[PDB]
A paper describes a structure:
We selected the fibronectin type III (FN3) domain, a small β-sheet sandwich of roughly 90–100 amino acids in length, due to its ubiquitous nature across phyla, and its popularity as a model for protein folding and engineering studies. This paper describes the structural and biophysical characterization of FN3con—a consensus-derived FN3 domain having increased stability. We generated the new protein sequence using the consensus method, which selects the most frequently observed residue at each column of the sequence alignment. Design of FN3con was carried out by complete sequence generation using 2123 homologous FN3 domain sequences.
Author numbering: 1 to 100
Write the structure that this text describes.
Amino acid sequence: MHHHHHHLVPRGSPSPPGNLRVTDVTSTSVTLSWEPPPGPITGYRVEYREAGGEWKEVTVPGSETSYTVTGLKPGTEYEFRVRAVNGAGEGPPSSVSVTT
């Protein structure tokens, strides 16, 4: 076995979002909810991909705590991760799995 990859992040960047969870799923949409980590937050990167492929991304407001990704393919395995951002850079992600 090899050790796990470390997420390299700038000192001063935020902790991961807390309590990340999927709060609604339809055959073409996924709603995420979370809580802000401590300190200044300037935004959140919401990243997602069909498991195994290429990652899409949307950045949402620092004041946001829920967001719905629409236009997804039915019956599909997805991976989502959310990273908090501030002036020092982006922090480590918290991730969840979903299927539509």
